[PDB]
Amino acid sequence: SGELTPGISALEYYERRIRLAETLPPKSCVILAGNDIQFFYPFQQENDLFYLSGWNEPNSVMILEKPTDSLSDTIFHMLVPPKDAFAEKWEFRSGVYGVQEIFNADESASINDLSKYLPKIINRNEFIYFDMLSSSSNFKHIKSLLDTIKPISKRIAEFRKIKSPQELRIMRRAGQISGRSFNQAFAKRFRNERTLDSFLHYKFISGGCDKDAYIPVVATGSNSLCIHYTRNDDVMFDDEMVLVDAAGSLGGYCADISRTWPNSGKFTDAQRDLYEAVLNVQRDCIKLCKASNNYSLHDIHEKSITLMKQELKNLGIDKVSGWNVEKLYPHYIGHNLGLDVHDVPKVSRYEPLKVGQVITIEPGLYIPNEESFPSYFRNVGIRIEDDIAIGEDTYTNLTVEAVKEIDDLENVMQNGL
Ligand SMILES: [Mn+2]
Numbered sequence: 001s002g003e004l005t006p007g008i009s010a011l012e013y014y015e016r017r018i019r020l021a022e023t024l025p026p027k028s029c030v031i032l033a034g035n036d037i038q039f040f041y042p043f044q045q046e047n048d049l050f051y052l053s054g055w056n057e058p059n060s061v062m063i064l065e066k067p068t069d070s071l072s073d074t075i076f077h078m079l080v081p082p083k084d085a086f087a088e089k090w091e092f093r094s095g096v097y098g099v100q101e102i103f104n105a106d107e108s109a110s111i112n113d114l115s116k117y118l119p120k121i122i123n124r125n126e127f128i129y130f131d132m133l134s135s136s137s138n139f140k141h142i143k144s145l146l147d148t149i150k151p152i153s154k155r156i157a158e159f160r161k162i163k164s165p166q167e168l169r170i171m172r173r174a175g176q177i178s179g180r181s182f183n184q185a186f187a188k189r190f191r192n193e194r195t196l197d198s199f200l201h202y203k204f205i206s207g208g209c210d211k212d213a214y215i216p217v218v219a220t221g222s223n224s225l226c227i228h229y230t231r232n233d234d235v236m237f238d239d240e241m242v243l244v245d246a247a248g249s250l251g252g253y254c255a256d257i258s259r260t261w262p263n264s265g266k267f268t269d270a271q272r273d274l275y276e277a278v279l280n281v282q283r284d285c286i287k288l289c290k291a292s293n294n295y296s297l298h299d300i301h302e303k304s305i306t307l308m309k310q311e312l313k314n315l316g317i318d319k320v321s322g323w324n325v326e327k328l329y330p331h332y333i334g335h336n337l338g339l340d341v342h343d344v345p346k347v348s349r350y351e352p353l354k355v356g357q358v359i360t361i362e363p364g365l366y367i368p369n370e371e372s373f374p375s376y377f378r379n380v381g382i383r384i385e386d387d388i389a390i391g392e393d394t395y396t397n398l399t400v401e402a403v404k405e406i407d408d409l410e411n412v413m414q415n416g417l
């Protein structure tokens, strides 16, 4: 109650628009074209528009106008599909009076009026904040009208990368729901990737999430070497481990979890040695996620490379010809996380992490089927991923519920919950 979207009140959405208007010159207008229905897939709103309004309907356009240097003169425009009894019955729209009473649009009109509504705002402003390079139908519309125009998405990204305390909590909720789902999967046996896939999906939704945050990875055995494996339909065998990358989303905010565990419910000595190597690197990289350390995301990645090389050296598999650490650990340490899984990709990887940012820490080892490696290591892929909120002098593991220590994993797998 009092919320506009799950976890976020209408007051925070208003304060986000105020913060953006605090960076805009007089006589400016920000134009954001929402997404359309993709024929029909579950609707994904343009996240910059959703971040500033909470509006989750297709075929919509948002305009934030700053006529003077005063923050109280700002006008929040919303052009939406019209409140239509016949259209709503076949296709429930909030209408033009709901978008003002619920979503707090100072001014609104039907999306049909776009060609007669937008130019009057454009003509009375000097700076037009619109990304001429995205696509939506209103985007192709709005762009043709514009044939000073300034980009806006990256400026919004600098705000989105710093999560508010309310954003951190709803992401904590998504991570906790997703994490407890993994624990329930640990306690059960699965003979096929699709059964484990559909199980976690049901636990995400029934646990309280709206949808999957992303297309899940359920890769058993040698399938774990395929970094982008999504088929999730292979038989699972007793001797191998399964790599699962899956998480739920809540109110538009994404969690992101990777766990690897043996299908038999018990680690072999070989599986233990490889798993602890990845867990050692992940634990040490998570400990760096304090803003007082002034590390950038790239700093942590390069430290993850150094840490992984030492783990390979401890395992004696660090000097295989043609298989340096960048071929056994061939991806980045992580990424910002928020309304998008790979959130705010335009912010700098090289600037120090700040309080409120949420990044993943997901190192991995993927040993090829080469005779130059020990046979008990070949075709074994491991990734361990958690969502870390950056704090002043500490951090918050948003997905800490999902166990990952070997003793914790084997306790759940063999004794249940
Ligand atoms: Mn992931």
Ligand SMILES: [Mn+2]
Pocket: 256, 334, 335, 360, 362, 385
């Ligand atoms: Mn990730």
